[PDB]
From a paper:
One truncation mutant containing just the kinase domain (residues 62–335, hereafter referred to as AtMKK5-KD) yielded crystals, diffracted to a resolution of 3.2 Å. The structure was determined by molecular replacement, and each asymmetric unit contains eight molecules forming a double-layered ring. The overall structure of AtMKK5-KD exhibits the classical bilobal kinase fold, comprising a small N-lobe (residues 64–149) and a large C-lobe (150–329). Interestingly, five phosphorylated Ser/Thr residues were well resolved on the electron density map of AtMKK5-KD, two highly conserved phosphorylation sites within the activation segment (pThr215 and pSer221) and three additional residues in the N-lobe (pSer66, pThr83 and pThr108). In our phosphorylated AtMKK5-KD structure, the activation segment of AtMKK5 between and including the DFG and (A/S)PE motifs (residues 205–232) adopts an extended conformation, protruding out from the catalytic cleft between the N- and C-lobes. Notably, the phosphate moiety of pSer221 fits snugly into a positively charged pocket formed by three guanidine groups of Arg115 from the αC helix, Arg186 of the catalytic HRD motif, and Arg210 within the activation segment. The pThr215 residue, by contrast, is largely exposed to solvent, only interacting with the imidazolium moiety of His182 from helix αE in the C-lobe. Consequently, the prominent αC helix in the phosphorylated AtMKK5 adopts the typically active conformation, where the important Glu116 on helix αC interacts with Lys99 from strand β3. Therefore, almost all the ATP-interacting residues in the AtMKK5-KD structure are well positioned, clearly demonstrating that the ATP binding site of the phosphorylated AtMKK5 is largely configured in the absence of ATP•Mg 2+. A charged or polar residue located on helix αD in the C-lobe of human MKKs can coordinate the ribose moiety of ATP; however, this αD helix is absent in the pAtMKK5-KD structure, replaced by a stretched loop (residues 152–157).
The MAPK kinases (MKKs) are dual specificity kinases, serving as convergence and divergence points of the tripartite MAPK cascades. AtMKK5 has been shown to play roles in plant growth and development processes, including the embryogenesis, stomatal development, floral organ abscission, stress response, and defense response. The full-length AtMKK5 contains a conventional kinase domain (residues 70–325) flanked by two flexible regions. Therefore, AtMKK5 is the effective upstream kinase of AtMPK6.
Residue numbers in the entry:
A (entry chain A): 63 to 77, 82 to 328
B (entry chain D): 68 to 76, 83 to 329
C (entry chain H): 65 to 77, 83 to 329
D (entry chain G): 64 to 76, 83 to 327
């Protein structure tokens, strides 16, 4: 949706460093993000991962990049502009509304997962929403692409507050985790967070390591309050099983009775 | 966490002021480094899970400002360090309890790694509970070697010191059973069953433990007890019996 | 020949041209130095063994090796007309004849389980006789089995296969053989076009070279070329590495048979 | 012996000549210091293990060993004539009889799964009874099966095999057993020739010693020497490691049978 960077003029700063640019011929907004190529081997691997994921994805609930630029040995990606920002600290107590938000996020995550892309950082701040009240999955900074449908992930990446139990306590399984199931955990914490309007663990999300790990790995996982409907209660239980094969896939949750509501 | 700290034994003695009952209070401190953080995960997961008469159950956990304070069962008559128990019937009922807790920990794939009389607590009811899970690992499978040279030097099997045979990898189930056989024989003699001090240098401990034949019960002792310490102190670790397989030893049949 | 019989004449680019004073014969002399680092000590053992063992018309032969003053000096063939760097071949029989000779040497090296790892126009030497020989073995490795992965990031970024720049999926392991046949195919399409086939400075930033090689489709011969040469380059430049032909299989391609 | 206060330090051989003042018998005494590093400690526990097991006429056995002050004192039998270092022994019958003794001592350690990894004339000692014994175990290792490789590049460079210098081709791994049979045959040819059998000196740079022993052909005995002895060094000094004979295969070689 552009051709070159002479058409683009930076207008504001978004949110990593992201700008709002305006494409001068069309008067249309975009987001422009820079990915700079330093000499670290593990930063170069994540540059290659993020570049591949960004150009390949095409889904209404994954933020699409329209163009990419290698101005001066830094890569500049041209993303959709999401004008109403993140769903961070959004309170969706309306259960109908929550279900329509959750369906879109689930379409997106099911897309990424059936292309073997694990996101590894699903937090309300990475779920962006626009004027049209549609929601799209965003940051691929720590996200990975997998050679099989069942290839384990060994890297400790992401935000600890929304990490799966098996993504924090790594001793028994020797670091490896079902990256898919880990994302389905991260969604279910997010959707309960929208329902509760707080972080659904009884610890500050800025809290210390051992204070977060004791709430997530050592407690029973968060359940939706008994006030809520069965199908929402049963939805979060399909997401926040502490044993990972017990929890559903993203594809399966789209057929869950909570999400089948519009 | 509104009870009152009483006595320092770091581990505290506390009394819960509503019910005036005693407890033991251990602190666990949150670190920045992966081996200490995963040791907190290994320990704080074994403390909550365990439920056996011969294992120190903990009752509650608290987080104060990023440090985990864990509230354990208070053991009345302290530890068995120093202790001399030379009546076989008495030592057989004492051994029967420590094996029951250990055979429980092993079948839940928990290695202790620091079984010693310092961590075999006793109470006024004269019953015995396995104590300090600070070095303990939870294994994936029933055969899963441990690479970490940790525990207490004097009580650990020769393969936990002479690491170069299997490249640092040892059987942890046998690693505890050698640590138990040293501790039961230290009860029968009244002293550490090796020709050096436990608080010695590395090399002097290494020659005593790895290089001589493992210690034996004196021939004064009955054949049941002499057979039992050789079933725990084998030098090649698969010959050592499992903790459960020792509860059918006829030394243990002397209990009650 | 001895180290005091032959003396320096002129520098090739670090490696010198020497003349054997007794036989008045041109030769090339390369110094190999023994560093205190142990990864240096393996690379000498690899490079030296490769140089003595190779015996093929299309791979630069070693004639003598000298132990002087803790330095190993290797007497190589002299090549009269330098390298094929910057070369442009537009006559297709001229390019098939060049290709068949580079393929003969690479098929030799691959059966002797040597992966060269810096195939580029710079390291393809040509003499007055117009015979092409494969040159620089400073980054080459000699492999245990017929397939056995490489870990090391060595070579020129611009002539690496995508899987040597990227290192995600097989996590830095790569087929060294298939990595060479890519390096060959870029070198042969560089001859046809007269330019680097990729639209970026060869002496470029990592990130600009990464998007040009990994993240666009591999370059094709233009349609103005023959079908046999179009299909040949596509057999070398497969982005999935086992789709690439071996050097052995490419020697039987219809384009190579244009050499007569 | 019984104690450390029954020995008097006499002369330096760290290894010491000591005399047992009650028995008036000489023995050899070695210190191994407790080092901080987990890998020197790994070498300490290997070195001590090998000493206690050995029961052979042609291996230096230790009679007893002692500890005080975090230092391990090991008490070895005294070899009063010294080493076979610089021995120009050309007699095809006398050397046959020295090659009988080093092969009995080496074949004992190899079926007892111990790789010596520093065989040299310096570590081959001789007594007043002119019996020969294998000595320093500072680098030596004990292995799990008969079929276990070594990964460490230690010892002395000038008596290494090609496979112990050319580390890359087998990813640091070498046959320790046949790598001692090389080190043996280099010593046996060094005894016959009275010089080190390669072109360069021992003390030369690693680039000089590599091109002599990796990149040249391995040495042979001159054809003037007996077709038993010329064949003998051919069974020890192969460039290909499995083409070496076993040290127990060599005990019944025609050269060692003389």
């Amino acid at each position: 949706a552009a051709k070159s960077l002479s058409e683009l003029e930076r207008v504001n700063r978004i949110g990593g460093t992201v700008y709002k640019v305006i494409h001068t011929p069309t008067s249309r907004p975009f987001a422009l993000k820079v990915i700079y190529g330093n000499h670290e081997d593990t930063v170069r691997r994540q540059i290659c991962r993020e570049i591949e994921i960004l150009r390949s994805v095409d889904h209404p609930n994954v933020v699409k990049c329209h163009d990419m630029f290698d101005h001066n040995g830094e890569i500049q990606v041209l993303l959709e502009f999401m004008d109403q920002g993140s769903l961070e600290g959004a309170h969706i107590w309306q259960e109908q509304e929550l279900a329509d938000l959750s369906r879109q996020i689930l379409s997106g995550l099911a897309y990424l997962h059936r292309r073997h892309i694990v996101h590894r950082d699903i937090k309300p701040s990475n779920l962006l929403i626009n004027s049209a009240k549609n929601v799209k999955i965003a940051d691929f900074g720590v996200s990975r692409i997998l050679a099989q449908t069942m290839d384990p992930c060994n890297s400790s990446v992401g935000t600890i507050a929304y990490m799966s139990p098996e993504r924090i306590n790594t001793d028994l399984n020797h670091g490896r985790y079902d990256g898919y199931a880990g994302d389905v955990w991260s969604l279910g914490v997010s959707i309960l967070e929208f329902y509760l309007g707080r972080f659904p663990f009884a610890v500050s999300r800025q809290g210390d390591w051992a204070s977060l790990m004791c709430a997530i790995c050592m407690s029973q996982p968060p359940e939706a309050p008994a006030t809520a409907s069965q199908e929402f209660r049963h939805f979060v239980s399909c997401c926040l099983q502490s044993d990972p094969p017990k929890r559903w896939s993203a594809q399966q949750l789209l057929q869950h009775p909570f999400i089948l509501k519009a």
